[PDB]
Amino acid sequence: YVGVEPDANKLGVIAVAIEDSGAGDITFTFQTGTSSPKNATKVITLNRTADGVWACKSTQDPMFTPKGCDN
Amino acid sequence: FTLIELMIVVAIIGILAAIAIPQYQNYVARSEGASALATINPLKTTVEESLSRGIAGSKIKIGTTASTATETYVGVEPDANKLGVIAVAIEDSGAGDITFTFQTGTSSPKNATKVITLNRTADGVWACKSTQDPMFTPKGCDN
Amino acid sequence: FTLIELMIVVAIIGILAAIAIPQYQNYVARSEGASALATINPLKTTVEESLSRGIAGSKIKIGTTASTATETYVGVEPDANKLGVIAVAIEDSGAGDITFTFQTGTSSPKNATKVITLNRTADGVWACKSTQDPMFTPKGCDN
Amino acid sequence: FTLIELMIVVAIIGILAAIAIPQYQNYVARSEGASALATINPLKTTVEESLSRGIAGSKIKIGTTASTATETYVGVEPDANKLGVIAVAIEDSGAGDITFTFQTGTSSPKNATKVITLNRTADGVWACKSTQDPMFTPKGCDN
DSSP, X not given: OOSSOTTSSTTXXXXXXXXXXXXXXXXXXXXXXXXXXXXXXXEEEEEEOTTOOEXXXXXXXXXXXXXXXXX | OOHHHHHHHHHHHHHHSOOOOOXXXXXXXXXXXXXXXXXXXXXXXXXXXXXXXXXXXXXXXXXXXXXXXSOEEOSSOTTSSTTEEEEXXXXXXXXXXXXXXXXXXXXXXXXXXXXXXXXXXXXXXXXXXXXXOTXXXXXXXXX | OOHHHHXXXXXXXXXXXXOOOOOOHHHHHHHHHHHHHHHHSTHHHHHHHHHHTTOOGGGEEOSSSOOOSSOXXXXXXXXXXXXXXXXXXXXXXXXXXXXXXXOBTTBOTTTTTOEEEEEEOTTOOEEEEEOSOXXXXXXXXXX | OOXXXXXXXXXXXXXXXXXXXXXXXXXXXXXXXXXXXHHHSTHHHHHHHHHHTTOOGGGEEOSXXXXXXXXXXXXXXXXXXXXXXXXXXXXXXXOEEEEEEEOTTTSOTTTTTOEEEEEEOTTOOEEEEEOSOTTTSOTTOXX
């Protein structure tokens, strides 16, 4: 267990879904009512392939997307 | 506290993130293969020596039980290496193989359920065969 | 300075907080276990070699004192690793164990007062036993 | 989050970097040379024994084919060691050499395309010659 609650960050919940093959993603979905309207219902995904390659994908606006995460 | 102070902090937080994380499961898989090969390699000496002294191939087992004049034990448990179990199956003719099968739950997903086989023919020729990926296969073992 | 400026700063301060901090003591405990095992693992070679050359088991001690033809010292202090002390107690028959006991005040609370034992039987069979938690126990050591 | 917190993190990141990495290819080259020499060293026993029993030098080959009363095989594949291939070329007069040529794609760049030769004269004198660098040349082999 990662040691934190899904709602530890009030901005949104965190979901960890890793398959048995090693492929999976870690998502942070901003929730309406606790996040700014621009970032509401946006997802930041840390996708991991079965080969162990980590990539960051974000559905936010390109201006608001943090560095190192593709949009 | 000023907004420029906090915006600089946010910018440095973003810069300190985005650090690219290279692949690392290949290193773990290669180390697991090397560890398995180094675990089952000395068992070749035990089998060959026992066959040289006349001990029957069916009497060469794996375990910590004290080896007698007629029975030989390799001196290690089958699960001594947590990566997988070790099986020794030598026939009376001298033909046999030593296998290291990685077990799910204690080995990396790439190497899970893979077998490294040290096949011995009846003529005394030793060969190493591995079912892992060619990149993860240790040197000296055919794939 | 405007109140909207300061309220935006307060909001960004709150947002920059609330960053979830995952568990980290497990990593420290696992690293401590690995370090202890790597510290006491080479001592197996010293004991086995000294027993092979005929040096009495009671003469195999731990310390930096120059080993003579009859006495053997592992070459490291008992407190060489600050995590805990190392004790070598080999009987004359060849049976003995090498223990690494973590000491309170220099080791993590999870691993404190835990012992990693490399037990050797009179028949020359080496086994690793650890009293730590099963999650923190290094591979190859039974719990 | 404060700017002093982040600047301390940046400073510790910089300090944790800058760790000098010493040379390591020399170790790999030396280990490769030692492994090659240990691979081709036992083949001296096979050639000498076969010549002593009267087997023709041209009949001493390398492979896992079952050796007959007239033909002798060393029992290993030419590519048994992934570092390079092994070639046995003994003349009928007894003169010959055993070569280990490192192959590009499986050996370190320093040792690539280098040959370790165990030359045998017609008088039965064994000598080791290596084309590697003098630092990487294993002991007992002239450069």
